[PDB]
């Protein structure tokens, strides 16, 4: 965490243990790629020196398979940057954006504030990219209600997947309304046939979750 | 969290990690709509800038299905406000109450103290509205004791549901006394028939929980 | 938490999040009535303004059924106080002891220090009363070793119950020695017959736990 | 926790909530007697006023059966002290060592620094004594690998027990080498027969754990 | 944790409870040897006096079997040092590197800064050595997908093992590509045969995890 000194200097303070205990808890249960982890990182990532944004992503417990796909995506993002930006004095080298060469204090210095933004942007871009592919959220069309699961659950998984897929929001909407009836368990579908009637694939989630989860 | 400066200025300090770790733990187990989460938010929501009251509701892990119904309810509450309050210089625009346009420091400023109250009021109103409909608490009449569950459990679920339903407190009372015998497992009902006798549907929970959970 | 100002004033500081995370964790697993929660509250309840002692009891996650019986016991304790103390200027009204009328700062003021003590005394008295009746600890005579449970477990449940029952300590002692053999599983009883011999119902727990849990 | 004032005075600061959350978490899972709890207490017990060393041992959740055997052992240790030390002005009375009579500030005072050491010594002595007898660690000779458990597990339980038993370290060593083959599951024993050969009861744990846990 | 005084002196501050609660949580679930614990230790080990780096390794809950193999490896590393460095005034004795003789303040002093680095280097070297042998990560060739586990899981275990084995990174790469198809469950293998075709043992994990985990 970059610390702005009273003199206006920038100093490096280690990420407080409490912050990791929050990110890690979300990481192990919801998943490292999981939207939940991405939001958490962003809330606290504003003041994090590039070096930390990478180290903290590494200190996260478990999610080893994900930390593999991500590490690859980050490398690909770096390749795009080196290709997009030919080496130049103003241009920041991939290492500077990674911050690997710099010491913690050097990363905190004002010159690398642009670098921190780029590193966070790659990490967040990478986390999102892995999520649509790793399928910890999953592929929506495939997600279907387990007989044991409540329609509230099927919706939770379906909403995650419909959100994860990189598709325009209009289409997400259609997917939420149409897929909820199609992939749902037959018993909810039957109950929705009795209540929703034709609107079964035209109704909103609010109308539907009330229909099967209630009664 | 709005910070009152010694100069009397208002500054924005990020919600401390410890606060999230408490809200999140209650969120994942009891539920985001769950009365427990609502109380927690309120205890710490007094000093939260509108922007946070929304962001913190978003950083909460899981409860994706609920975060869908809520997001809709908040939008509906905004529609009521814009309809109730025609746009005016004194009137706060929905965005100002959401705080989306403002920077964190701007939200903390004294002018938007009214906005924070309205935003908290919508969030808390929305959480309560989703709870009666999502049925994480459930529909009381439907709640019934699982043979495995103790009468203490059936009461815990029944009390949650009887509280969640938006009905006058007198009626809640009648529901607590009458429903507890009706939806309870037969074995407790038989035991209560032997001890409570006629008052089975007239007795209080204290009398009843002593009857089946004890012996 | 009442804060004694350097000027000697009393100011209200919110219960720190860490304190709740401890009380809540004990609350959900051991139980709100559970002796464990009662001890925790007492350690930190010394500096808590009456309003908090009630609000914190309410912020506790789960234990909804218990929070019902308690709320009733607290009301009964208030009825005893109003009956015991006829209204008078010196007399503190039930509301003042509850602190419902006062603002947080008003509760912290020196005048209501007596009120905080009374409120804590009712809460702790109420928690103890609910425990003997709710039977989260249970009725000792009924507690018996599940075949799966170790004699160490049966003792843990039996000791909880023998302690919970409102009986003079001499009798508790007799119950601990006699009940441990009687309600224990036959296999431990047989093993104790072989080692303890006649003293089976005269031996201490130390002698007995060594007998079945060991070998 | 005794606080050394800048003036050199000693003041009493309550054990921070974070410390309990660590001790309690270790307590409920590993066990109150468990070596793990004993080490934790010692790390933080250096600055704890006798009163706390007892109160904190009491605030620990669960382990009710253990808190019974310990309470007895502490009483026995007190009996040894009163017998060993005839009452005298220099001699500290059992109550002073327990600190029950003193207020928190009085316990923190320099005069009772010797008392805190004695109280910690009894608590730690008591915890160790209960552990060899309670058998939460268990009796080594009895510990045997469950077919499901890995040889890594059997070693974890066997090492705990061989350590718990109050025997000279030389003998512990022999027990670790000999018992590991004898109480282990036959399948590991067969595999060790194939790899260790004669040294089966002469090999070290490092050699053995590599033999069955690996391959 | 060594504290640099404003005077430039070095003072010893106890490891904050929050740090242990993070290390312990990672320790009990992922494992003490687990790469996750090693990274955590390193992030916070920079300012830890040798005495702590050992004591903290000891305060870690559970992993008793591992704490045995490690304790042996640390002793072996010490033997290498005493053999590599003949005793000399400049040479640091094994005890000084362990810090057992020194008081906490003495360890924090500047003279033993070299010792702390050596102690951390042995601990980290020891943790890595135990990991390849204990097989909490396991032997890669042996790791195979359980029918229940997802190909995402098999990859998580396989990647851990391929990383743990002390082999040059080129070979790790070949192992990741070849082993993933070979040890995977037949159903994923069949699906990969249909999609990957010949590249089944030439494809990358990104290509493969998309193939079976998706669809």
PDB file of C-alpha atoms in Angstrom, chain E residues 15-120:
ATOM      1  CA  UNK E  15       4.206 -10.899  16.118  1.00  0.00           C
ATOM      2  CA  UNK E  16       0.734  -9.294  16.032  1.00  0.00           C
ATOM      3  CA  UNK E  17      -2.108 -11.776  16.678  1.00  0.00           C
ATOM      4  CA  UNK E  18      -3.649 -10.946  13.284  1.00  0.00           C
ATOM      5  CA  UNK E  19      -0.504 -12.250  11.497  1.00  0.00           C
ATOM      6  CA  UNK E  20      -0.761 -15.631  13.277  1.00  0.00           C
ATOM      7  CA  UNK E  21      -4.474 -15.910  12.550  1.00  0.00           C
ATOM      8  CA  UNK E  22      -3.604 -15.633   8.854  1.00  0.00           C
ATOM      9  CA  UNK E  23      -0.651 -18.034   8.866  1.00  0.00           C
ATOM     10  CA  UNK E  24      -2.522 -20.561  11.074  1.00  0.00           C
ATOM     11  CA  UNK E  25      -5.631 -20.545   8.855  1.00  0.00           C
ATOM     12  CA  UNK E  26      -3.473 -21.256   5.779  1.00  0.00           C
ATOM     13  CA  UNK E  27      -1.479 -23.778   7.855  1.00  0.00           C
ATOM     14  CA  UNK E  28      -4.364 -25.992   9.015  1.00  0.00           C
ATOM     15  CA  UNK E  29      -6.163 -26.154   5.646  1.00  0.00           C
ATOM     16  CA  UNK E  30      -3.479 -25.991   2.884  1.00  0.00           C
ATOM     17  CA  UNK E  31      -0.730 -27.465   5.129  1.00  0.00           C
ATOM     18  CA  UNK E  32       2.401 -26.200   6.940  1.00  0.00           C
ATOM     19  CA  UNK E  33       4.717 -27.409   4.120  1.00  0.00           C
ATOM     20  CA  UNK E  34       2.162 -26.231   1.492  1.00  0.00           C
ATOM     21  CA  UNK E  35       3.596 -23.595  -0.875  1.00  0.00           C
ATOM     22  CA  UNK E  36       0.833 -21.305   0.405  1.00  0.00           C
ATOM     23  CA  UNK E  37       2.294 -21.275   3.947  1.00  0.00           C
ATOM     24  CA  UNK E  38       5.808 -20.747   2.577  1.00  0.00           C
ATOM     25  CA  UNK E  39       4.759 -17.617   0.642  1.00  0.00           C
ATOM     26  CA  UNK E  40       2.855 -16.175   3.634  1.00  0.00           C
ATOM     27  CA  UNK E  41       5.842 -16.687   5.947  1.00  0.00           C
ATOM     28  CA  UNK E  42       8.128 -14.932   3.437  1.00  0.00           C
ATOM     29  CA  UNK E  43       5.883 -11.870   3.054  1.00  0.00           C
ATOM     30  CA  UNK E  44       5.959 -11.276   6.822  1.00  0.00           C
ATOM     31  CA  UNK E  45       9.314 -12.976   7.577  1.00  0.00           C
ATOM     32  CA  UNK E  46      11.432 -10.017   6.443  1.00  0.00           C
ATOM     33  CA  UNK E  47      11.225  -8.261   9.831  1.00  0.00           C
ATOM     34  CA  UNK E  48      11.121 -11.387  12.043  1.00  0.00           C
ATOM     35  CA  UNK E  49      13.974 -12.047  14.513  1.00  0.00           C
ATOM     36  CA  UNK E  50      15.391 -15.547  14.044  1.00  0.00           C
ATOM     37  CA  UNK E  51      13.860 -16.610  17.375  1.00  0.00           C
ATOM     38  CA  UNK E  52      10.372 -15.798  16.031  1.00  0.00           C
ATOM     39  CA  UNK E  53      10.865 -17.513  12.629  1.00  0.00           C
ATOM     40  CA  UNK E  54      11.323 -20.731  14.691  1.00  0.00           C
ATOM     41  CA  UNK E  55       8.747 -20.007  17.429  1.00  0.00           C
ATOM     42  CA  UNK E  56       6.068 -19.007  14.870  1.00  0.00           C
ATOM     43  CA  UNK E  57       6.803 -22.241  12.935  1.00  0.00           C
ATOM     44  CA  UNK E  58       6.142 -24.009  16.287  1.00  0.00           C
ATOM     45  CA  UNK E  59       2.981 -22.073  17.269  1.00  0.00           C
ATOM     46  CA  UNK E  60       1.358 -23.259  13.989  1.00  0.00           C
ATOM     47  CA  UNK E  61      -1.611 -25.519  14.835  1.00  0.00           C
ATOM     48  CA  UNK E  62      -1.605 -29.126  13.668  1.00  0.00           C
ATOM     49  CA  UNK E  63       0.668 -30.458  10.930  1.00  0.00           C
ATOM     50  CA  UNK E  64       2.378 -32.383  13.774  1.00  0.00           C
ATOM     51  CA  UNK E  65       3.758 -35.011  11.376  1.00  0.00           C
ATOM     52  CA  UNK E  66       5.197 -32.267   9.163  1.00  0.00           C
ATOM     53  CA  UNK E  67       6.648 -30.375  12.158  1.00  0.00           C
ATOM     54  CA  UNK E  68       8.578 -33.616  12.787  1.00  0.00           C
ATOM     55  CA  UNK E  69      10.162 -33.968   9.321  1.00  0.00           C
ATOM     56  CA  UNK E  70      10.926 -30.199   9.254  1.00  0.00           C
ATOM     57  CA  UNK E  71      12.539 -30.212  12.711  1.00  0.00           C
ATOM     58  CA  UNK E  72      14.820 -32.934  11.326  1.00  0.00           C
ATOM     59  CA  UNK E  73      15.588 -31.026   8.116  1.00  0.00           C
ATOM     60  CA  UNK E  74      16.442 -27.859  10.104  1.00  0.00           C
ATOM     61  CA  UNK E  75      18.860 -29.949  12.222  1.00  0.00           C
ATOM     62  CA  UNK E  76      20.440 -31.317   9.006  1.00  0.00           C
ATOM     63  CA  UNK E  77      20.783 -27.770   7.585  1.00  0.00           C
ATOM     64  CA  UNK E  78      22.508 -26.753  10.842  1.00  0.00           C
ATOM     65  CA  UNK E  79      24.896 -29.718  10.460  1.00  0.00           C
ATOM     66  CA  UNK E  80      25.761 -28.533   6.929  1.00  0.00           C
ATOM     67  CA  UNK E  81      26.437 -25.009   8.276  1.00  0.00           C
ATOM     68  CA  UNK E  82      28.686 -26.180  11.130  1.00  0.00           C
ATOM     69  CA  UNK E  83      30.561 -28.426   8.638  1.00  0.00           C
ATOM     70  CA  UNK E  84      30.661 -25.664   5.955  1.00  0.00           C
ATOM     71  CA  UNK E  85      31.708 -22.978   8.480  1.00  0.00           C
ATOM     72  CA  UNK E  86      34.402 -24.081  10.977  1.00  0.00           C
ATOM     73  CA  UNK E  87      33.866 -22.304  14.313  1.00  0.00           C
ATOM     74  CA  UNK E  88      35.322 -18.771  14.224  1.00  0.00           C
ATOM     75  CA  UNK E  89      34.735 -15.374  15.898  1.00  0.00           C
ATOM     76  CA  UNK E  90      33.179 -13.936  12.707  1.00  0.00           C
ATOM     77  CA  UNK E  91      31.328 -17.250  12.091  1.00  0.00           C
ATOM     78  CA  UNK E  92      27.826 -17.331  13.670  1.00  0.00           C
ATOM     79  CA  UNK E  93      27.302 -20.455  15.822  1.00  0.00           C
ATOM     80  CA  UNK E  94      24.263 -22.587  14.963  1.00  0.00           C
ATOM     81  CA  UNK E  95      22.703 -21.422  18.257  1.00  0.00           C
ATOM     82  CA  UNK E  96      23.103 -17.756  17.237  1.00  0.00           C
ATOM     83  CA  UNK E  97      21.402 -18.468  13.859  1.00  0.00           C
ATOM     84  CA  UNK E  98      18.682 -20.420  15.735  1.00  0.00           C
ATOM     85  CA  UNK E  99      18.784 -17.510  18.232  1.00  0.00           C
ATOM     86  CA  UNK E 100      18.075 -19.953  21.090  1.00  0.00           C
ATOM     87  CA  UNK E 101      20.763 -18.421  23.363  1.00  0.00           C
ATOM     88  CA  UNK E 102      19.805 -14.775  22.679  1.00  0.00           C
ATOM     89  CA  UNK E 103      16.963 -12.837  24.369  1.00  0.00           C
ATOM     90  CA  UNK E 104      14.307 -11.377  22.051  1.00  0.00           C
ATOM     91  CA  UNK E 105      15.953  -7.915  22.153  1.00  0.00           C
ATOM     92  CA  UNK E 106      19.411  -9.451  21.482  1.00  0.00           C
ATOM     93  CA  UNK E 107      18.056 -11.200  18.347  1.00  0.00           C
ATOM     94  CA  UNK E 108      16.607  -7.876  17.111  1.00  0.00           C
ATOM     95  CA  UNK E 109      20.040  -6.205  17.494  1.00  0.00           C
ATOM     96  CA  UNK E 110      21.864  -5.314  14.217  1.00  0.00           C
ATOM     97  CA  UNK E 111      24.667  -7.872  14.790  1.00  0.00           C
ATOM     98  CA  UNK E 112      22.222 -10.792  14.246  1.00  0.00           C
ATOM     99  CA  UNK E 113      20.566  -9.385  11.067  1.00  0.00           C
ATOM    100  CA  UNK E 114      22.765 -11.810   9.085  1.00  0.00           C
ATOM    101  CA  UNK E 115      21.603 -14.600  11.432  1.00  0.00           C
ATOM    102  CA  UNK E 116      17.926 -13.858  10.767  1.00  0.00           C
ATOM    103  CA  UNK E 117      18.532 -14.164   7.014  1.00  0.00           C
ATOM    104  CA  UNK E 118      20.283 -17.541   7.471  1.00  0.00           C
ATOM    105  CA  UNK E 119      17.524 -18.828   9.798  1.00  0.00           C
ATOM    106  CA  UNK E 120      14.786 -17.794   7.345  1.00  0.00           C
TER     107      UNK E 120
END
